[PDB]
C-alpha cells in the first residue's frame, strides 16, 4: 500500500487519543463522546449546556491552549430529534493541533452563544441563525447576515428546496423589483446516483 494509499500517522493518533481521555476525564459533566478518526482528527461530542465551560477550558488550559476558532458550523440531520449539529473547529498554536467540539439542538432549544469565549463567533453563529434557524442566546447582534432582508425561512435546512419559494424580477407597473412564486423554465433535474451495492463493509450498520 505504498504509492496510492495515504499513510497513517499513528503518533498523532495515540496523542489525540490520550488528549481525548484527558478532556473526557477533566470534564465528565458534559463530554458525552470522544472519537478519533482514521485520519487522526479528534472530536469531542458534548451536551449543549456545556458550550461555555468546554470552550473556555480548551481556550485557557495550559495543555490545551486552543486559542483560535477556525470554523463554526451547523449540520442538518433530519432523522434526529435534535436535528442540528453545531461544530466548533479549534486551533491550538502552542501544540500545533486541531480539535472538534460537537453539540446538538433542535429548532426550539437555544444554544448559548460563545462570543464570551471567542469573539470570532460574532458572525459565525449569526450565520447559523440566517441559514439554519438555530437561535443563540445572549448574542450581542443576532440577525440575518447572508440572505436578503425580507427572506422567510432558513435555507440550509434540508427540508428547504434548492431554489427558493420566491424569485425576484423588475416589474414596470409598480416600478419596482418584486417577489413572485418561483417558476423555472427548466426544472432542476434530480439524479438518482446511488449505487445499490455496498461500497464500504467497515461502515456497515447492523440490521434489525
Amino acid at each position: 500500500t505504498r504509492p496510492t494509499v495515504r499513510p497513517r500517522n499513528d503518533v498523532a493518533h495515540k496523542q489525540l487519543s490520550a488528549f481525548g481521555e484527558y478532556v473526557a476525564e477533566i470534564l465528565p459533566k458534559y463530554v458525552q463522546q470522544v472519537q478519533v478518526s482514521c485520519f487522526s482528527e479528534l472530536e469531542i461530542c458534548i451536551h449543549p449546556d456545556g458550550v461555555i465551560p468546554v470552550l473556555t477550558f480548551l481556550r485557557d488550559h495550559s495543555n490545551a491552549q486552543f486559542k483560535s476558532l477556525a470554523d463554526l458550523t451547523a449540520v442538518d440531520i433530519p432523522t434526529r430529534q435534535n436535528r442540528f449539529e453545531i461544530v466548533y473547529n479549534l486551533l491550538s498554536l502552542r501544540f500545533n493541533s486541531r480539535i472538534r467540539v460537537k453539540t446538538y439542538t433542535d429548532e426550539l432549544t437555544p444554544v448559548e452563544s460563545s462570543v464570551s469565549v471567542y469573539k470570532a463567533a460574532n458572525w459565525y453563529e449569526r450565520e447559523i441563525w440566517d441559514m439554519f434557524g438555530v437561535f443563540f442566546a445572549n448574542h450581542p447582534d443576532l440577525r440575518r447576515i447572508l440572505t436578503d432582508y425580507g427572506f422567510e425561512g432558513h435555507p440550509f435546512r434540508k427540508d428547504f428546496p434548492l431554489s427558493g419559494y420566491v424569485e425576484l424580477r423588475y416589474d414596470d407597473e409598480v416600478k419596482r423589483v418584486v417577489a413572485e412564486p418561483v417558476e423555472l423554465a427548466q426544472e432542476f433535474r434530480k439524479f438518482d446516483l446511488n449505487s445499490p451495492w455496498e461500497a464500504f463493509p467497515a461502515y456497515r450498520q447492523p440490521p434489525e
Binding site: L27, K29, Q32, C45, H47, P53, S62, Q65, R80, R94
Partner: protein
C-alpha cells in the same frame, strides 16, 4: 538582558518575570486548592503548575527558562498563567467534575445515519 520587545503586538515586556510567575503559580495553586480532590482538573493542573513552578524556581536566567518552560516568550507564559488562573476561578463556579447532566438520544452521534 532587557529584551526590548516581545515580538507580539500589544504584549509589553515584563521586567521581572520570575517573581511574577512565582506569584501567579502560587495563586493558581491557592485558587486550585478549593476544588475537591477526586476531580481530575485539580490533579492535572497541580501537576503541570508544580512542574512549571519548579522550573521557574530552578533557573535564574530568563532566556534559558524560556527554552525549558517550552512555551515561547516568557511574557506569553505569564499571560497563559493569568488565563489558567481565570479558568480555575471559572471552574470553581461551573463544577464540571460532576457526572453527565443528561444522556444523549440513542442515535444522536451515530454517523452515517
Amino acid at each position: 538582558l532587557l529584551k526590548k520587545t516581545t515580538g507580539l503586538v500589544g504584549l509589553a515586556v515584563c521586567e521581572t518575570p520570575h517573581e511574577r510567575l512565582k506569584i501567579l503559580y502560587t495563586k493558581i495553586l491557592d485558587v486550585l486548592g478549593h476544588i475537591p480532590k477526586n476531580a481530575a482538573y485539580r490533579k492535572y493542573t497541580e501537576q503541570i503548575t508544580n512542574e512549571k513552578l519548579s522550573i521557574v524556581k530552578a533557573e535564574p536566567d530568563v532566556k534559558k527558562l524560556e527554552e525549558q518552560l517550552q512555551g515561547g516568550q516568557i511574557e506569553e507564559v505569564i499571560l497563559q498563567a493569568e488565563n489558567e488562573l481565570s479558568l480555575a476561578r471559572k471552574m470553581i463556579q461551573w463544577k464540571p467534575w460532576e457526572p453527565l447532566v443528561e444522556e444523549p438520544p440513542a442515535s444522536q452521534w451515530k454517523w452515517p445515519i
